[PDB]
Symmetry: C4
Amino acid sequence: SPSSGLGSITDLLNNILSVANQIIYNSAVALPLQLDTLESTLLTAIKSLQ
Amino acid sequence: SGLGSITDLLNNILSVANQIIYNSAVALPLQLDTLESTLLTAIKSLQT
Amino acid sequence: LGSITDLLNNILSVANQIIYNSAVALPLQLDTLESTLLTAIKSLQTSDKLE
Amino acid sequence: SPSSGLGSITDLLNNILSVANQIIYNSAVALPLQLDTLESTLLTAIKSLQ
């Protein structure tokens, strides 16, 4: 209903898209980076044994 | 169910999306830290 | 109802599944990874006391 | 594009759907694959002292 209905719906959809964009950053960049760092830390501690 | 209920759906989706931010940016990273620490101690108990 | 209502219902549905994956399935895999590794390390100690 | 197509709204819903899907793949498949690859690497590093 002019023009706010389009505007209010458009604004929520815009919020949701920015959050999902952040979630895809967390899952495809941040966490994979955290797991790589964790692997090598532990991998180093284990090789530190022999 | 006019514009209002669609606005409820949107709020429900936004709220759930927020929970997913918590899980992925807070809970999982913290779980990984706790795990890293537990294994680090155990490996270290082999050393000394 | 309806096209937008249908799309939104789908999105929500995928979202609830993402909540399960990230709050239940992944933490379970992390716990099991921890358990499995601790067990490898530990059974190794138990293998020290002999030979 | 004709107004009947809804314009702003329709593209947003498609993007959010596309992203949600990629998030599903990352949490259900990619991260699990990386976790398994991690566990093997560490186990193999342990297997190599034994």
